[PDB]
Design a protein around this ligand. Structure first.
Ligand SMILES: CN(O)C(=O)C[C@@H](CCCc1cccc(F)c1)CP(=O)(O)O
Ligand SMILES: CN(O)C(=O)C[C@@H](CCCc1cccc(F)c1)CP(=O)(O)O
Ligand SMILES: CCN1CCOCC1
Ligand SMILES: CCN1CCOCC1
Ligand SMILES: [Mn+2]
Ligand SMILES: [Mn+2]
Lengths: 410, 410
C-alpha cells in the first residue's frame, strides 16, 4: 500500500488528489492517506478527516487548532495526531509511515515543505512550479545530498514529458540531476500551451485588456494567479525554466507550442528524431495519479479519450511581440545565475498589480524587464543553508524593486 | 557493436534498413552488417557488398551464384562466405556472429526465415505482417520453446505502439507472449490509418473504382499489393490481427482511426486512461532503426518534426459499410482458430484479381466473406511441426477456394 501525505488538501491540487485516490481505492485498495495539511480551512479539513481518517492532521493557523481538536471527537473510533504550524509540517515529513508527499501549496510554505520532504528522503510530488524556478539551485543541491529523495513532476506538461520517457532509463537517474537528458536520450521538448484567453487579440486589443477579461468565462477553471499568468503566457515562461531544471534540457532545445485543444500535454523528441507525446482530456487527476504510482500505473474509471470526437488537434508558434513575458523568461533562463529568482519575484508583484487593476497588460513585462536590468549576478553560495538565505533575500529584493518601480512611475 | 543480417536487402525494407545503417554509422560506428540475402539481383547485391563488406553473401537463385563469386573478386581485401538458397539462409541464421535479423521478405520465404531465426535464438526485426496474421499460433509456440528469441515489430503502427511502452515492463515479457498487455498495463489501442485514396467516395462510386484509381499518384509510394490493401483498408484489418497477436490485446480493445496526415503512427491507452503516442514524418527508417536499437536509441541526422508547420492533425471513424474488409478482419480475428489464416489467403487472391482488373471493389470483400463462410474450425495441433503443416494446408485450401469462387462466377 502507498502511504501518502497531502499538503494543501483543500486547494485545487489537494482536492483533485483526494478525488482520484478515492476513486482508485474503490477499484482496489492501493492508497493510505496518512496525513492532511491545510492553511486555514478548518471545517473542510474535518470533513476530509471523517472520510479518509488520516493518522496525522495539521493546520498552519494556530487560532483554529483548538477548534479542530474538538470537531474530531465526533468521529467514531479515531485517535489522530493533531498538529499545527511549520513544526507540524516538519513532523509529518519525518514520519517513517509516509512514503510520498503531494505539495499542493505555493510560495514559502510550498518551498519550505518541499525542502523538509527532501531532507527526509521522501518521494515528493511537486505541483508548485515557482519553487523550481526560484530555488532550482537549492533543490538540486539538496537532492544531491539526499540521495534517495526524488521530485516527481505534477505540473501537467512536465508530467506529460515524464510520462514520455522510458522508465528503464529514468530509474538510472532522477529529476534535477545533471545528465538527465543525456541518459534519457532526450534531444528536444515541445512544451504545449493553451495559448490563454488573449491568444487571438491584435496588438491594439491587447493594450486594453483587463484582469476581468482574463478571469471571465475561463476555458479552464483555476486560481487567479495562474489564470493571469496564462493570459500573459508567463505561465509558459516559468514552465520553460521548470523544464530546464527538472530535465537538464538546454533552453535552445525547448520550443513553446500553442495547442488550443489541450489534449496533447507536451512531446519529447529523442536523439533519433522519434517523437513521443502524452494525451488526455484536460484534467489534473492523471498527472497527480502518475506522480503517486510511478514507475507503475493503476486502473481508473476515468472517461476514455474519444479521438474521433475530439476530431482536430492544432499547433502554432506564439508571437513574442504579443507575449513578451515568454522572451523575458528565456532571457532570464539563459543568463542563468539568480535571474530566474528575480523573474519569478517581479512577476509575483506585476501579476498582482494587473489583477487588482493598477497597471496595464504591457506594464507587466515592462516592470519585469526593468527589475531584471537592475540585478547583478552573485557568486552562488556553496553551503545549502547560505544558498536558501541567498535565494530568499534576492526574492525579497526583487519584489520590493518591482513595487518601487510601480510607485515611481505611478 | 550491433551485428545485423538483412534478408531481402534489395527490397523496400532492406534498402531503407541499409540507408539508416549507413547514415547512423557516419555519426558513430554502431552497426556491423554481417550478412546480405537477396532473391536474384546479383548486380545490386555486389554493389551492397562493395560498400558494406559483409562476412556472408547469399542468393536464392542458383543460376546467378557463380556470377556472384566472380563479381566479388573485384572487391579489394575481401573474402566473404558466399552461399546459395534455403541452405545458405539456414547457415546465416545459425552463425554465432549474427545477433539481429531484419526480415524484409514476404510469403513463405519470410515465414521460413523467421522460423530459422527464432530456432537460433535471434532477435527478429519482422516487417512481414502476413506471417503474423497467418501463422501467429505457430510463431507463439516457437517463441515459447526458444526463450531467448524475440520478435520486434517493424510495421510502422506496431513499432509506434511498441515505442509507447515502458521498457522497464517490456523487458519482463516479450512480443507474442500471453499476458503482454497485462504486464505492460495496456487497456486499449488506437490503430492509425491513412484511410487510403477512397474516404470521400460514395458507395456508388466505390462500386466502380479500379486498380488504376488505387495505384495512380497515391499518397504514399509503396508496393502494389499493400497499395491495394490500403485502398480497401484490408491493410488495417490485417494490422488489427497483428496487434492482437503481438501485444495480446482483445479485439474489442482495438480501434481503427483514420488519421490522414500520417504524423501520429498509433496510440496506446493505459489502464489509468493516460494515452501515449508516437509521432514522426511518414518514413520507414524510424521503425526499422528502433527494431535494431531497442531497448536503446541512437543519434540520427533525420529531419526534425516541425509541429507548427504540420499545423493540423485530424481523426475520424472509418465507415465499415464503405470498407467491409475491416469488418471481415475483426470477424475472423474474433472467431479465432485459423480464420485469420483463411482471411489472409483469400485476400491474397482477391487483391491480385482486383489488381489485374478481373473483379470489382466489393467483389474483394464478397470473395473473402464467402471463403470465410466455407471454412470449418479445426482442432489446433499441439505438435509444432504438425501446426506449421496445418497452417500451410489451410492457406493453400483458402487460395484455391477463392480462385474457384472467381472461376465459377466468371
Ligand atoms: C494545467 N496546467 O499545468 C497549467 O499550467 C495551466 C495551462 C493548461 C490548462 C489546460 C489543462 C491541461 C491539463 C490539465 C488541466 F487540468 C488543464 C494553461 P496555459 O499556461 O497553457 O495557457
Ligand atoms: C507504412 N505502413 O506500415 C503501412 O502499413 C502503410 C500505411 C501507412 C502509410 C503512411 C506511412 C506511415 C508511416 C511510415 C511510412 F513509411 C508511411 C497505409 P494505410 O493502411 O494506413 O492506409
Ligand atoms: C533585457 C531584460 N533582462 C533580461 C534578463 O537579463 C537581464 C536583462
Ligand atoms: C460472415 C463472414 N465470415 C466472417 C468470419 O467468420 C465466418 C463468417
Ligand atoms: Mn502547467
Ligand atoms: Mn503498417
Amino acid at each position: 500500500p502507498i502511504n501518502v501525505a497531502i499538503f494543501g488538501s483543500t486547494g485545487s491540487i489537494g482536492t483533485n488528489a483526494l478525488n482520484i485516490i478515492r476513486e482508485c481505492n474503490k477499484i482496489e485498495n492501493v492508497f493510505n492517506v496518512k496525513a492532511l495539511y491545510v492553511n486555514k480551512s478548518v471545517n473542510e479539513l474535518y470533513e476530509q478527516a471523517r472520510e479518509f481518517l488520516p493518522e496525522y492532521l495539521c493546520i498552519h493557523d494556530k487560532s483554529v487548532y483548538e477548534e479542530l481538536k474538538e470537531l474530531v471527537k465526533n468521529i467514531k473510533d479515531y485517535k489522530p495526531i493533531i498538529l499545527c504550524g511549520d513544526e507540524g509540517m516538519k513532523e509529518i515529513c519525518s514520519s517513517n509511515s509516509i512514503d510520498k508527499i503531494v505539495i499542493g501549496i505555493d510560495s514559502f510554505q510550498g518551498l519550505y515543505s518541499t525542502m523538509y520532504a527532501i531532507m527526509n528522503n521522501k518521494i515528493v510530488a511537486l505541483a508548485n512550479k515557482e519553487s523550481i524556478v526560484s530555488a532550482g539551485f537549492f533543490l538540486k543541491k539538496l537532492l544531491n545530498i539526499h540521495k534517495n529523495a526524488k521530485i516527481i513532476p505534477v505540473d501537467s506538461e512536465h508530467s506529460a514529458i515524464f510520462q514520455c520517457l522510458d522508465n528503464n532509463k529514468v530509474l538510472k537517474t532522477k529529476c534535477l540531476q545533471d545528465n538527465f537528458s543525456k541518459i534519457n536520450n532526450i534531444n528536444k521538448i515541445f512544451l504545449c500551451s493553451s495559448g490563454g484567453p488573449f491568444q487571438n487579440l491584435t496588438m491594439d486589443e491587447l493594450k486594453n485588456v483587463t484582469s476581468e477579461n482574463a478571469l471571465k468565462h475561463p476555458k479552464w477553471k483555476m486560481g487567479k494567479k495562474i489564470t493571469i499568468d496564462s493570459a500573459t503566457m508567463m505561465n509558459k515562461g516559468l514552465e520553460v525554466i521548470e523544464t530546464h531544471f527538472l530535465f537538464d534540457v538546454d533552453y535552445n532545445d525547448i520550443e513553446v507550442i500553442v495547442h488550443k485543444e489541450c489534449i496533447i500535454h507536451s512531446c519529447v523528441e529523442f536523439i533519433d528524431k522519434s517523437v513521443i507525446s502524452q494525451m488526455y482530456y484536460p484534467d489534473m487527476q492523471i498527472p497527480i495519479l502518475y506522480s503517486l504510482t510511478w514507475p507503475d500505473r493503476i486502473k481508473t474509471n476515468l472517461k476514455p479519450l474519444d479521438l474521433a470526437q475530439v476530431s482536430t488537434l492544432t499547433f502554432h508558434k506564439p508571437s513574442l511581440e504579443h507575449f513578451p513575458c515568454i522572451k523575458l523568461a528565456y532571457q532570464a533562463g539563459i543568463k542563468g545565475n539568480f535571474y530566474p529568482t528575480v523573474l519569478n519575484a517581479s512577476n509575483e508583484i506585476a501579476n498582482n498589480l494587473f489583477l487588482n487593476n493598477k497597471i496595464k497588460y504591457f506594464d507587466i513585462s515592462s516592470i519585469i524587464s526593468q527589475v531584471l536590468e537592475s540585478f547583478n549576478s552573485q557568486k552562488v553560495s556553496e553551503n545549502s543553508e547560505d544558498l536558501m538565505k541567498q535565494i530568499l533575500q534576492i526574492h525579497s529584493w526583487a519584489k520590493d524593486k518591482a513595487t518601487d518601480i510601480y510607485n515611481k512611475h505611478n
